[PDB]
RNA sequence: UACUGUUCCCUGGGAUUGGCUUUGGGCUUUUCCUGCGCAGCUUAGGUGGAAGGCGAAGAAGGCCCCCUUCCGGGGGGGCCCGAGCCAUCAGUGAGAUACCACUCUGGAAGAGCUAGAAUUCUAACCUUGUGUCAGGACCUACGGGCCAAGGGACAUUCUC
RNA sequence: AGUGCCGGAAGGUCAAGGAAGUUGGUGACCUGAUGACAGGGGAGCCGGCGACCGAAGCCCCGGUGAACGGCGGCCGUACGGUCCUAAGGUAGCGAAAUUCCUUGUCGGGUAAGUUCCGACCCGCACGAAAGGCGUAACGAUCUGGGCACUGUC
RNA sequence: AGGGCCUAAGAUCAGGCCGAAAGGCGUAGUCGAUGGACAACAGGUGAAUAUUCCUGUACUACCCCUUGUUGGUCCCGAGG
RNA sequence: AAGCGAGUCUUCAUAGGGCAAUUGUCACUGCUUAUGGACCCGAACCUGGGUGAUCUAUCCAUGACCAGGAUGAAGCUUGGGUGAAACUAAGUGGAGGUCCGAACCGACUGAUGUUGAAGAAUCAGCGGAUGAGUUGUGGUUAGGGGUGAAAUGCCACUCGA
RNA sequence: AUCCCGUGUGAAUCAGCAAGGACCACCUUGCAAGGCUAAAUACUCCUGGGUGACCGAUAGCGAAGUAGUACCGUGAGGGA
RNA sequence: GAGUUGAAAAUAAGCAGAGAUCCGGAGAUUCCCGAAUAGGUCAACCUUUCGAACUUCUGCUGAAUCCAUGGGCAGGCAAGAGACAACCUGGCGAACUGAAACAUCUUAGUAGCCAGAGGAAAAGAAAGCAAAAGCGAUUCCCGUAGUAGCGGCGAGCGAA
């Protein structure tokens, strides 16, 4: 069956690749939970 | 103990059946895990044993919202 | 090597569970070609709006290269040239991609759509330390915190 | 060869799970003749059927016997003919803790020996690590014979 | 002779991990002699005890006092 | 079955055929039948939960024990003998799952015992007896188990659970 | 169908949601994912009061006597 | 309100009309073991420093990191712990048996163990019944009924 995870990520840090310090782009929850929101580099809408 | 401290979920009884109905009993366990969580205020690791649905609830309602329903906190 | 099951173990789907990157999968639209038993000017699959398109919205023939090639001869970038070429007509079971409506075969560029990959990354996850960190004092005593080292989204664990 | 184990392309077979499509139910809403219900049937909502993708395993292919196991007939004159089989027992040993027929036959041992020793081979049905055959020593081991000894007789 | 000292096999186990419950693992410690560590002998007596009572002669551990040194004590690092 | 009803079902749908066109009820007592152990006594077993390693099987920790007598290994020393090794005569030495044999541990043969002196002994002999040895104390292992130099033997006169 | 659960998904809010034995339509009924609550009901180691077509020492509790005693069993336990 | 100092009953000395012995209600004491609780233990003992051990209450403190948590020291009548015939709630959960064998099924969610609490416990105030007629939280008896049903449509099980 499978389901893709789509989250509503607002940024804070510049981010090496995709960031603006103000994107509204979407990613999987594995980015927010494991990488960013521990470090405090982003937030949820 | 096969108990998620947040959801209160236990393992479940099951007479798991053959094609011929010659039953047994076994436990359908909970999908627990040892995993780090991320506290809002503290901003630390929290090394907990949770279900998979516990993760979903935490990502829904921020840890402290969930963690009030299991009295113990600050590790 | 009786019937029926249970367990150990192996294998896939799903959760834990993230990230870029290139190479050649399937399917959906744009547009463009392609597709020589025999009649034979015709490297034409079936069918059709039905007789002027097109040309000076810079032409016939040609220079040399490109795409295709069952090597019969299609199709085409730029331009010396300079504004013509031509549809029924005669051969066919069919008429001319002169304009254009709808689709089979087999293929060329873009766009979407997902999936299959191999590698690496690291931040989940796993594992190490006679590495360090201390209460009134020890941890070369289990463990705990902190930097770290090695694996690495595999593995472990849950369900099917 | 069979089984086991180990390794190995493509092909077949192949679950859960998806997945393009088919087909049914219900029904706003149009409709149809005398008989009292009947045709459809948009959207939504329900249920079935599934072209394709889908691993291990198994078939399939190779290797392995101090892996489970197995190691032939028939007919003629040491020698040949012919059949079947994966292959037809090599060395050694052989009437044995194996031998049925059986007190096999021959020799030794005794006045006389279905037990004993050596040889023969017609091995019913030994046999090479469920080892084969030998071997000094050792045995409250089995099994024959002698001397000494005695109420065992 | 044992205990008031010490530890082995083993036991129980704070915190810690794991488990329907009961509980299981396991460190710090704590128990646990069959082992280590420690000070007494003869003679005498008496219905029934005696290295125990009696007589003699001993030894271990503490509190006096004479000299003293300024710290002791535990933890702790070694020898043994 | 809808349904119809003194009829109804069967079928073009009749004729025929089936079944109908009627009759108490509540007790007490007995007789049988049913359900519960069910007329009484009697298994081998199965399952759950506990108790046992003072017997015995293995191991662990700590102690203890093995009279007396024999044989004479390796090595070593001194000669003999070599380029040096090798080899060989005497001394020294005290090995050994070595020998004979008490305690100790066993259990081969017989006799005795058989409502025994004894629910495995007595007697006469037998094997080991410095080791894979014996044994005291204190412990460990538990029955869909343990333990087993392996007989299904032992796990408290109980063992194919 | 209704009720509850492991795994994965994952709504709506009274123009709603759920039930009325799959399922859809129309009616009717109710408001799930927060709690509390006497009675009538079950029983007898036991206390008081009453009763018996109950027993009378091989009966009645195992136990009419200082019985769970004597005794047996390592022990659980059995048991006059 | 008259004789007493338990049972078996004997002695010795006492206490009793200024009222004992007795009977009732309320208090005080209660060695040692046992939840056992200062620590140890081979229950009824040994060692002490003489102590409710351990946890949540409550006062201060101050670890590895700021806060915090672990931890240490204090005060505490100090709540909890254990026991308890059946009944009861929750957890785990047999087999013999019946089916003339047996695996679905039955025995049964019974026996057993484990945890918990009361005089009862659990249930309980409709996301409920029922049928176009209505009922109004539970729980228990009569009944519907051995009917509707389920069932190797077998044994059996059996509602509202």
PDB file of C-alpha atoms (C1' of nucleotides) in Angstrom, chain H residues 16-70:
ATOM      1  C1'   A H  16     -14.023  -8.680 101.791  1.00  0.00           C
ATOM      2  C1'   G H  17     -20.763  -4.178 104.253  1.00  0.00           C
ATOM      3  C1'   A H  18     -16.186   2.243 104.832  1.00  0.00           C
ATOM      4  C1'   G H  19     -19.019  -2.559  99.865  1.00  0.00           C
ATOM      5  C1'   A H  20     -14.654  -6.981  97.403  1.00  0.00           C
ATOM      6  C1'   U H  21     -15.145 -11.655  93.816  1.00  0.00           C
ATOM      7  C1'   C H  22     -18.081 -10.968  89.521  1.00  0.00           C
ATOM      8  C1'   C H  23     -20.652  -8.539  85.231  1.00  0.00           C
ATOM      9  C1'   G H  24     -20.688  -4.487  81.368  1.00  0.00           C
ATOM     10  C1'   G H  25     -18.584   0.239  78.662  1.00  0.00           C
ATOM     11  C1'   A H  26     -13.999   3.191  78.177  1.00  0.00           C
ATOM     12  C1'   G H  27      -8.644   3.562  79.040  1.00  0.00           C
ATOM     13  C1'   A H  28      -3.295   1.948  80.544  1.00  0.00           C
ATOM     14  C1'   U H  29       0.534  -1.916  80.082  1.00  0.00           C
ATOM     15  C1'   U H  30       1.851  -5.655  76.235  1.00  0.00           C
ATOM     16  C1'   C H  31       9.400  -9.544  77.053  1.00  0.00           C
ATOM     17  C1'   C H  32      11.202 -12.039  72.094  1.00  0.00           C
ATOM     18  C1'   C H  33       9.898 -13.858  67.013  1.00  0.00           C
ATOM     19  C1'   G H  34       6.765 -12.769  62.932  1.00  0.00           C
ATOM     20  C1'   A H  35       4.941  -7.227  57.395  1.00  0.00           C
ATOM     21  C1'   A H  36       9.891  -6.953  61.000  1.00  0.00           C
ATOM     22  C1'   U H  37      11.582  -2.181  59.916  1.00  0.00           C
ATOM     23  C1'   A H  38      19.270  -0.016  63.566  1.00  0.00           C
ATOM     24  C1'   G H  39      22.707  -4.181  61.082  1.00  0.00           C
ATOM     25  C1'   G H  40      23.280  -9.628  60.835  1.00  0.00           C
ATOM     26  C1'   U H  41      21.059 -14.224  61.241  1.00  0.00           C
ATOM     27  C1'   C H  42      20.359 -21.098  61.010  1.00  0.00           C
ATOM     28  C1'   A H  43      12.247 -17.544  63.512  1.00  0.00           C
ATOM     29  C1'   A H  44      11.888 -16.814  68.942  1.00  0.00           C
ATOM     30  C1'   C H  45      19.074 -15.171  69.045  1.00  0.00           C
ATOM     31  C1'   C H  46      23.683 -12.079  68.205  1.00  0.00           C
ATOM     32  C1'   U H  47      25.861  -7.279  67.556  1.00  0.00           C
ATOM     33  C1'   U H  48      25.482  -2.340  68.340  1.00  0.00           C
ATOM     34  C1'   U H  49      26.528   4.032  67.327  1.00  0.00           C
ATOM     35  C1'   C H  50      19.855   2.296  70.816  1.00  0.00           C
ATOM     36  C1'   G H  51      17.965   3.632  65.314  1.00  0.00           C
ATOM     37  C1'   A H  52       9.950   2.973  61.725  1.00  0.00           C
ATOM     38  C1'   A H  53      14.090   0.002  57.166  1.00  0.00           C
ATOM     39  C1'   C H  54      12.079   1.387  52.599  1.00  0.00           C
ATOM     40  C1'   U H  55       9.532   4.399  49.561  1.00  0.00           C
ATOM     41  C1'   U H  56       5.319   9.755  48.068  1.00  0.00           C
ATOM     42  C1'   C H  57       4.566  13.504  51.517  1.00  0.00           C
ATOM     43  C1'   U H  58       8.394  18.559  53.778  1.00  0.00           C
ATOM     44  C1'   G H  59      12.834  21.739  55.316  1.00  0.00           C
ATOM     45  C1'   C H  60      17.393  22.668  53.493  1.00  0.00           C
ATOM     46  C1'   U H  61      20.875  21.551  50.188  1.00  0.00           C
ATOM     47  C1'   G H  62      23.872  20.909  45.632  1.00  0.00           C
ATOM     48  C1'   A H  63      26.677  15.944  41.030  1.00  0.00           C
ATOM     49  C1'   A H  64      28.702  14.882  36.284  1.00  0.00           C
ATOM     50  C1'   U H  65      26.135  20.616  32.517  1.00  0.00           C
ATOM     51  C1'   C H  66      23.045  26.860  33.338  1.00  0.00           C
ATOM     52  C1'   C H  67      18.125  25.346  35.102  1.00  0.00           C
ATOM     53  C1'   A H  68      16.925  20.461  36.371  1.00  0.00           C
ATOM     54  C1'   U H  69      17.446  15.224  37.912  1.00  0.00           C
ATOM     55  C1'   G H  70      20.275  11.585  40.746  1.00  0.00           C
TER      56        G H  70
END
